[PDB]
Design a protein around this ligand. Structure first.
Ligand SMILES: CCC(CC)O[C@@H]1C=C(C(=O)O)C[C@H](N)[C@H]1NC(C)=O
Ligand SMILES: [Ca+2]
Length: 489
């Protein structure tokens, strides 16, 4: 590293998370000027779920110069958290942990009006990822109310005759009667008030074989685990916790995906950050992007009551389940513009004028080259005008083969003199090249730091390629002043 690269990683092999690998950056400057970040702590190489992944978190209280040790606010204990080198040979590289639960793909959002920070992540039961998730919500209705459903070990396969009801009391739904079992606020199981326990797994390679084996370490038996007497429906869930002390402590685990459509396979986060609307009637509305294999691809969840209740919106009718990861910016009057990945070989744009309740048709963005699978992008508002115009910024790779050639762009917003979704246009005037065109560049997250500089946390390799799996120390943090970025090539 150069002098300029000192301090250019927040999370790294050897830090407090005990992970050798990381992916999926999230970076967010708080209204206090505290700056925070989160990423996946991918213990089992860089694989997506199924695997063993916890959500890591870290804070800077000097404007994003300096970063404290990381914490793990969303973590599962069914398999141990340890530093391990994942094989990168031609056979071993493909091997994933088969039996762990996982938190994956974070989103950070602050409510400025209460000063509350929300951390969201996808929540995967044991041995589950997007690709083997079962179709369904994971909840049942009993007399109209939604309860998390559960499979007792000695019931028939696919049979969920039990539910988590008030106080965490587990009920038998065929008889409608409370059992002697319950869950606590961590979703750990209890029998007649006693903590139920199971053996933690360790994982070790012998050659290219991954041996997942019990240790003698006891942990709390959790309904998300492979070895639980009661087990959740094996679909994807949305998890959230909030903090009122800038990440010093977290609230109890929330499973917020009660709205998961019954016809959906997966419903997951567009990682990065969410948005709080600043202007218009709905200033203070919290909105978070989602996508699904369902009736719809692109979706959102929003809250009008400071995060207590969330509404799900579908933004299209696509049943294809493409990887429609999105990030959202706001126009000067409070309307919203969302940029998203597609499975169509371009980045797309959609608009809402009612604060995220309804969305226009997808409009391709021709300025940026991408692959047919796409990559996640980061888009943010900037608080200072640029050339006297309102400004947004976009980070993304810029190539048609591979994840490489990262740019940061500056888009200047103009009134076109038209009414609805057509009220504004974006001039992508500036395009800054992060590195040499062949250097890898995948997922990224921008934030505006309190001094008006731009922070960036990004994947400095190609995270799609099967030949760049299981690299260490590829999550890079850089800072730029706005004049550096005002490049026209
Ligand atoms: C969700 C489907 C999609 C299938 C390729 O995977 C996403 C692609 C990713 C990618 O293109 O690198 C990273 C995301 N972490 C992953 N999401 C999940 C939930 O695993
Ligand atoms: Ca309001």
């Amino acid at each position: 590293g150069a002098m300029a690269d000192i301090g250019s990683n927040i999370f790294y092999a050897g830090d407090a998370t005990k992970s050798n690998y990381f992916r999926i950056p999230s970076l967010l400057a708080l209204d206090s000027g505290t700056v925070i970040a989160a990423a996946d702590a991918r213990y089992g190489g860089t694989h997506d779920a199924k695997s063993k992944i916890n959500t890591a978190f870290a804070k800077s209280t000097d404007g994003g110069k300096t970063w404290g040790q990381p914490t793990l606010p969303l973590k599962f204990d069914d398999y141990v958290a340890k530093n391990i080198d994942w094989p990168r040979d031609s056979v071993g590289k493909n091997v994933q942990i088969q039996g762990s639960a996982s938190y994956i793909d974070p989103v950070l959002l602050e409510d400025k009006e209460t000063h509350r920070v929300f951390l969201f992540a996808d929540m995967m039961p044991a041995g589950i990822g997007s690709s083997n998730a079962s179709v369904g919500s994971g909840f049942k209705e009993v007399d109209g109310k939604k309860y998390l459903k559960l499979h007792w070990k000695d019931d028939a396969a696919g049979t969920y005759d039990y539910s988590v009801r008030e106080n965490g009391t587990i009920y038998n739904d065929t008889t409608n009667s409370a059992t002697e079992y319950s869950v606590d606020g961590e979703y750990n199981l209890y029998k007649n008030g006693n903590a139920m326990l199971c053996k933690q797994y360790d994982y070790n390679f012998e050659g290219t074989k991954l041996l997942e084996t019990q240790t003698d370490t006891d942990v709390n038996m959790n309904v998300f685990y492979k070895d639980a007497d009661f087990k959740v429906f094996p679909t994807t869930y949305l998890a959230m916790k909030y903090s009122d002390d800038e990440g010093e402590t977290w609230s109890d685990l929330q499973i917020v995906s009660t709205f998961k459509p019954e016809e959906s396979k997966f419903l997951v986060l567009g990682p990065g950050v969410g948005k709080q609307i600043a202007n218009g009637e709905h200033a203070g509305r919290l909105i978070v992007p989602l996508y699904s294999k369902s009736s719809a691809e692109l979706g959102f969840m929003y809250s009008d009551d400071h995060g207590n209740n969330w509404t799900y919106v579908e933004a299209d009718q696509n049943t294809g389940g493409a990887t429609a990861e999105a990030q959202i910016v706001e126009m000067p009057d409070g309307s919203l513009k969302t940029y998203l990945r597609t499975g169509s070989g371009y980045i797309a744009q959609v608009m809402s004028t009612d604060g995220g309740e309804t969305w226009s048709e997808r409009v391709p963005l021709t300025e940026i080259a991408t692959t047919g699978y796409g990559t996640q992008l980061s888009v943010i508002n900037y608080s200072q005008p640029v050339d006297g115009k309102p400004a947004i910024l976009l980070s993304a790779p810029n190539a048609t083969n591979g994840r490489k050639n990262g740019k940061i762009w500056i888009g200047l917003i103009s009134e076109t003199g038209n009414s609805g979704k057509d009220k504004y246009s974006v001039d992508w005037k500036y395009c800054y090249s992060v590195d040499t065109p062949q250097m890898g560049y995948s997922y990224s997250c921008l934030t505006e730091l309190p001094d008006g500089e731009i922070g960036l946390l990004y994947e400095k390799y190609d995270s799609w390629s099967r030949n760049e799996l299981h690299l260490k120390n590829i999550l890079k943090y850089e800072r730029f002043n706005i004049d550096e970025l005002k490049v026209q090539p």
